Symmetry: C3
Subunit: 336 residues, 3 copies
């Protein structure tokens, strides 16, 4: 009742972590603080609240991924509805757990403010993604204060998937989106300059082409890409044609800035949760991996969860799905 | 609890309706899809929630109006407080009923986002009208998706009565209001181009004069006018002087665009719920009807309800008030 | 349940007050309506809700201050969280009490919308200060309507302490802040032109220097200053060096506009609730009083409360603290 006695917030205790290299941006590459080139390779897990509700928010989950799936990175898709439902204090307390778990395993976290829609008009694809510019700023303000100087938390992915859904949500306007990302980056850098902001384009974070002429005017950032199989639609389906289309919309970015494909994956058109744009016969797997390997692109596969699709696992015993078995071997081999 | 299992929305089933002409804008006229000039002539009823609370939300209400009062149109004043109180899903479910009822009777609906105040500062005449730009956009987003390709729903009246109340609510600024209406129209047209947006001026939707120099830069729209009796204040009260004042503030619009007088009416200064600007000795009735007839102006009288004033009916047996008996005969004669 | 029956608001009954001079702005001075120069000299009390919760919201509080502490002014720091918690109707009802109490004692009130942070991004120092541009406008709309033509309520302090906290809350931008204050002033002046708006600069209302080149372009306003002891940091601590630094950041304003130091005070570095920027050995007391006396600056000391620091009183028997005993004698002597 005494609102005047509500405490000011505290910061994560960095002394509680074991030594872990910071990742930073240098030119078009990530590097660690030993100066070695670094690639994020890993997976999304589900929202923290979804996992808690079925008692699957456990260090054992992180251990499975680190020990058996070859990941060096986990992306946490923090859904605004879940952020509100647990409330900031409880959600941050669970993020703290993820930090300790990842640190102990020597892996890194991408914190993703997981909305879909058009923030400047505050209209979204679905209520679970609902937010405001105010809440979005406040999220990043809180996150940046709490995890200041924490090497485990490497990337702040400002807004998962910008889209206006054919301008039903507003008029897509690069200049206003650019300005807003720059505004968020400024709040972040005022609080912690050691973190990597990740910025996305339109068409559900597929289209980075506006940065050819109007890149975000801030240093030390990276760009997101979500190159699902059906985003590029060549008439003739082969490596060369897909590569050219990917080149044009997002791959070119990797020549100048670091790029993380923070969502990618596929399921068979008749498989579990099959929907546009994730339907593929499986030929996309080797093709996107080859493409990313050639361009030095980082990635986190969607999704290491048995309910949300396309799945990497069919159950909580971690039985691999088609894409799961494929990416697991890719990541194990890369780790070598 | 599982927010991730909350369904995506569905659209009204157009196959459930009987054949009904679409109304569209051509130049300064409405026409039906047989190419014949069309005039909206009808009434407002109360907010859906008010009617539900006294069990008056019934097809019989629509039947009374269509069969005995000669209407071809009903305006639904959706109050934002009621929208929130029933919640979108339940409110839309009742709008669905209105659509089926009106369609069956061969009449049309105007959906009116019924707020009073200044949306750009989000300040209003009364809490019952309280909203935000975000909620207003979301309302129109939901409405346009749900009633796509539904002929019965003819007009989307974006914001009932713009006013700053002597600039106590903000600084009235045509350019910012124009831009915001254009933004809403763009969201709507991205989703359904077969609907007619209705745009209002300041001074409680009385003053359209800014469109002489700066009309909304979008095709297929109409303009609202609320010419209550005491809005124009000639020193000498006659046809000629009122006509000239109406000409100057709103009637001129009918020369170039279609105009719907979506609110109009009167009660005696000593009658039920008498207040500025609806007080009149009754001479306004024939005068506004003559004026509208000469200019081909569409109209929906306020209000076909026994509680809200000025009333068209004194009870739920539909006993006519003074203005009610007057307008009933006007509409019956026009229908012939 | 019947939202349509929710009453429109009413105004404070001015006939309930005894005769009391209006205070107005003339050049760089306040004057009363007898044309005599006037200086606000008094204190802050705690938020109305805090006082109510411990049964300390009583006329006896105002009587103690007027009769024994020599005040002619009390500042009410209305915290947005408390505004929401009591709700506008109940909070305004208690403000009405303060008005009657102050009027009877011949003292004046400053109503302070008591937030800390950056309103244009709606990010704040602490949740208790949380608000929006919409809520802030609505507060001033309600206040200005209710207390129209009430001499007892002299000053509307638009936003207590603007700060971006090292730009962690947003990018401080004088031009956008200026525009927003002008917008609030316009809402206020549209409703009551007899009230004095009080505008603040950045750095927790310490830095008025932007008004040298870009003052608020409205007449009849005053400027706030919060010159706590540790805001100016001269290497050599004496009258001359502090005076020069105060001159440069806020004191210059008093040459052209009226200035009210609506928060000021100190506690010993080892005293109760000691924190930056209010720690001082006590030499600040005579120095700030001398400075303000020379420049004709008005002031309300923070704070006449035994819980909130720095205190003027150590208990509810009004036992004076160090700064309390000091300021009490200053105010008693000035009153003579
Ligand atoms: O968050 C929990 C939820 O996630 C679900 O997956 C999401 C997925 O994360 C998201 O990327 C995906 O977005 C797609 C849209 O749904 C889809 O409409 C859109 O299609 C467009 C077409 O409309 C357009 O014509 O063409 C392009 C290219 O073909 C296409 O993108 O594509 C985007 C992605 O780019 O939405 C998913 C949900 O539908 C999980 O499936 C679910 O289990 C979880 O609850
Ligand atoms: O929504 C449920 C509610 O509706 C009530 O009627 C409303 C009516 O719909 C609305 O148009 C009307 O607005 C008027 C303002 O109330 C009135 O103040 C304003 O007056 C101005 C003057 O202030 C100005 O000086 O001059 C002009 C011209 O004379 C004048 O307009 O006029 C507007 C309309 O233009 O408000 C009504 C409520 O007061 C029902 O009466 C009620 O039963 C329902 O609950
Ligand atoms: O509202 C109830 C609450 O009030 C508490 O006092 C507030 C006080 O009213 C407010 O002015 C004060 O603001 C100070 C900030 O807290 C402080 O961080 C800031 O420091 C900056 C430094 O960060 C900067 O480096 O330098 C400058 C100059 O030295 C300095 O200002 O200073 C501002 C004031 O200018 O915050 C108090 C709370 O911390 C009561 O103490 C409490 O009991 C009540 O509950
Ligand atoms: Cl898009
Ligand atoms: Cl107006
Ligand atoms: Cl500041
Ligand atoms: Mg970090
Ligand atoms: Mg339609
Ligand atoms: Mg006053």
């Amino acid at each position: 009742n005494d609102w005047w006695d509500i405490p000011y917030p505290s910061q994560f205790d960095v002394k509680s972590l074991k030594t872990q290299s910071f990742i930073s941006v240098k030119g078009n590459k990530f590097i660690d603080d030993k100066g070695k080139t670094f690639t994020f390779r890993g997976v999304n897990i589900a929202d923290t609240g979804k996992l808690l509700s079925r008692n699957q928010w456990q260090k054992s989950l992180f251990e499975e991924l680190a020990n058996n799936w070859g990941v060096n990175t986990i992306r946490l898709p923090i859904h605004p509805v879940s952020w509100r439902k647990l409330g900031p204090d409880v959600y941050l307390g669970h993020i703290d757990e993820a930090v300790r778990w990842a640190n102990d395993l020597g892996i890194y976290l991408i914190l993703d403010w997981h909305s879909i829609g058009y923030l400047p008009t505050e209209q979204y694809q679905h209520p679970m993604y609902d937010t405001t510019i105010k809440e979005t700023r406040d999220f990043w303000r809180r996150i940046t204060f709490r995890y200041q100087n924490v090497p485990t938390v490497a990337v702040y992915e400002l807004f998962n998937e910008p889209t206006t859904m054919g301008n039903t949500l507003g008029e897509r306007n690069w200049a206003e989106w650019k300005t807003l990302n720059e505004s968020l980056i400024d709040m972040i850098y005022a609080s912690d300059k050691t973190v990597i902001p990740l910025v996305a384009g339109f068409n559900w974070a597929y289209d980075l082409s506006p940065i050819k002429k109007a890149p975000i005017e801030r240093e030390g950032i990276a760009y997101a890409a979500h190159p699902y199989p059906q985003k590029a639609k060549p008439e003739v389906k082969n490596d060369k044609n897909f590569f050219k289309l990917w080149d044009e919309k997002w791959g070119f970015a990797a020549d100048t800035y670091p790029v993380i494909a923070t969502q990618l994956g596929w399921v068979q058109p008749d498989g579990y949760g099959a929907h546009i744009p994730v339907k593929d016969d499986g030929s996309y797997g080797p093709r996107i991996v080859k493409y990313m390997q050639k361009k030095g692109v980082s990635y986190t596969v969607w999704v290491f969860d048995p309910d949300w699709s396309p799945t990497m696992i069919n159950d909580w015993d971690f039985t691999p799905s088609e894409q799961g078995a494929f990416f697991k071997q890719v990541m194990l081999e890369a780790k070598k």
